[PDB]
């Protein structure tokens, strides 16, 4: 385990998940006389620590999450990145090390997390910043004892993805089909029923009981099937792409964010292949050779750090970028584009959101609640329609009727139905600010 | 890979389980020009095996279990054990390697069955034979990543074993305890209801249902629950102890073959232990430390072995004895006490068993159909009444008024109720065996 400097250093973990550095690295610096706080982006893993700690060690430490903070006093501190964050960040000197848990994390949260940190541990009185994690970016799917993997061609009776699946390699035994979208799903299984073989589609929604616990199946899941479920797989076919959060500088008049299908990871090709042999020997087929590596993100991502920290965290655009300059300015961290200064400005222009809007947009949970609720504002304003009615608008619900003309486009958050403007003061700044 | 030698050689295999030592080792040697004989323990395994190879590379390998052969003409043959011995053994110039996997495995029909082809394999024509295994003898629990092990001590409020479960420990959370008895199960659940916890007593008969899939709950179970259940255990309690059959040379009059609690084993620490430490952390208290290691097994299980050779297959107690004896001869085996002569001895004064009643003990499929078949017939030729009439004896029961008078104890087969002589002609016979 990384010493702590007399300084202070920003050391790297990379360990197994449960071989100790989230809870014994941190009760060898507390009986070393540090005060230790582990961030991490679950609220499950998190309690998760507290409960071995107390069971397995006698540690009772303090944890922090979201619904409530339980301080006992113990110099560990257990908490997630996201209420460290709500918390403001670090607090003079409060801790001697700060182990950063599953630092390839690309969620928003877990990146501004760790940027907060990376900026302001120091100045905290911080000697040390671990940044710990068991799926290092740049990580790549490496071969499998257990398990054949067998190229997809363009023979078979099934087409799949550009390539063919050979009805003989499905006919017989269990078997587990991972598609993209639950309605590539409904439309594989429906096609193979069609041709005579017992095939369930799953997805986010359905209940697992819907999977046969015995008896030949063909599965057609997206990656809604928790790797832990697992039954008996023979073999597995994926279609190697997954849909995800994307921002496209369209010019239309702006930027979209939206979910697109790309081509898939290490970590998913893995972890889809990694269905099969388990207590013997399995099968995996694909449709493309692995090639993305692991810790790679979205600028998208980048915008969703600035919304919350416009939405939630108090922080102005300036601040946001500051603290994520400290995590892009860090190597052995995930990856984007460098779109720091044109989100920054972006958010920036976006002067005056009605909190109203914005409070509901937070309390509803749904992505981007700050872009969301100042769309709205906007449209509100001029009296417009927001651009659809998608439940994506509905803080502006309460006065559809009240609302007519085309919608004032700010950006393509999704899908529009509604006519619009490009016209609009701030659609104008926005551009101004695209390149 | 071993290499065929040019005349004759035993060769070990230790690799895990799936990583191609029963598919793509067969495959390669196949590949080679070699008819290749593929032996396990188990018939799902088996037809397992043929379903890989014909989907994963294209070989449609001879299947053959006790239900049916399937000939297919290909150069390997997956067979069972059991099977390969109802065959008969090795015929002459069938294979050139055979491999006999799991061959740590000691129940009767794997120590049988690999002590017959030690025995003729050389003679039949092959020029190699494999010894494969994942769970090599004399094997030993060793050190787990994900897994704290803390030993339990005499401080706890609930009583374990001669040491003692302190309350806290398991109250909140998902815990898993392994008693040896479903009846201290059922004992341990009901303390610990009581008690106040969510706790359920599972067993061979329950159904997995029974286990809340989330929620703190504190199963009690025995080793019935698969280790492929699992459902998020936070920490597992382990007695240390199974049930086994063992024999006794107890002179009363002869020896007693019964099921008794004794020291777990290696393999055994290693499964239960198991069960926790999957995604995350786990914690693993125990009454003793680890002990056994694998490999060992009971003179009770040579007993099967003549039982079966008398009952199944044809074989007279000299000719299971040369078989058995090769099997004692080969190194790198699991081992027991050398009882070949005693048990053969003894199998052998058995003359003239009712073949009907023989037919009848098979059939039901109990143990020792042979010397439950044989004490019955011994009872009906002096119309004395069996042992007891627990179903074991049911092959006496369409009689029961027919007979009367002390029973004529051959030898102790489980529990005995009705009264005794010892003096019956073949009571002598094995008393002069004993030693």
Redesign the interface.
């Known amino acids: 385990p990384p010493a702590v400097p007399q300084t202070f250093q920003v050391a790297h973990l990379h360990a ?5 550095k ?3 690295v941190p009760a060898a610096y507390a009986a070393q006389g540090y005060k230790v706080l582990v961030l991490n982006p679950s609220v499950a ?1 998190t309690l ?1 620590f507290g ?2 700690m107390s ?3 006698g540690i009772d430490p303090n944890i922090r999450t979201g619904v409530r903070a339980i301080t006992t006093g113990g110099p560990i501190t257990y908490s997630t990145y996201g209420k460290f964050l709500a918390d403001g960040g670090c607090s003079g000197g409060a801790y001697d090390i700060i182990i950063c848990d599953e630092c390839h994390s690309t969620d928003s949260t877990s990146i501004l997390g760790i940027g907060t940190v990376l900026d302001q541990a120091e100045t905290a009185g911080a000697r040390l910043v671990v940044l710990a994690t068991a799926t290092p970016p740049g990580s790549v799917t490496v071969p499998h ?2 398990i ?1 993997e ?1 190229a997809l061609s363009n023979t078979g009776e099934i087409p799949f993805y550009g390539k063919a699946i050979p009805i ?2 499905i006919r ?2 269990r078997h587990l089909i991972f598609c993209h979208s639950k309605k590539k799903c409904d439309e594989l299984a429906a096609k193979l029923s069609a041709l005579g073989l017992n095939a369930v589609a799953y997805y986010r929604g359905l209940d697992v009981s819907v999977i046969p616990t015995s008896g030949d199946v063909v599965v057609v899941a997206t990656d809604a099937l928790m790797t ?1 479920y697992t039954g008996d797989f ?2 597995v076919i994926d279609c190697n792409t997954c849909v995800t959060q994307t921002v496209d500088f369209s010019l239309d008049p702006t930027f979209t964010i939206d979910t697109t299908t790309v081509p898939q990871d290490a970590v998913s090709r893995s972890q889809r292949r990694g269905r099969t ?1 388990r ?5 995996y087929r694909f449709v493309t050779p692995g090639e993305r590596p692991s810790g790679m993100f979205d600028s998208s991502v980048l915008c969703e750090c600035y919304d919350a920290g416009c939405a939630w965290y108090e922080l102005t655009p300036a601040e946001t970028s500051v603290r994520l300059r400290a995590y892009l300015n860090t190597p052995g961290l995930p990856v984007c584009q460098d779109h720091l200064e044109f989100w920054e400005s972006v958010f920036t222009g976006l002067t005056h959101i009605d909190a109203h809007f914005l409070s509901q947009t937070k309390q509803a949970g749904d992505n981007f609640p700050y872009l969301v609720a100042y769309q709205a504002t906007v449209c509100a304003r001029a009296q417009a329609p927001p651009p659809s009615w998608d439940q994506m608008w509905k803080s502006l619900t309460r006065l559809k009727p009240t609302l007519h003309g085309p919608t004032p486009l700010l950006y393509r958050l999704g899908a529009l139905q509604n006519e619009v403007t490009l016209t609009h003061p701030v659609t104008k700044f926005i551009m101004a600010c695209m390149s």
């Open positions: 197994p998940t449960g071989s100790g989230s809870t014994k893993a998760g409960v071995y069971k397995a060690h004892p257990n054949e067998v003989e390699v017989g035994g832990g023979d073999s042999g207590g013997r020997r399995g099968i």
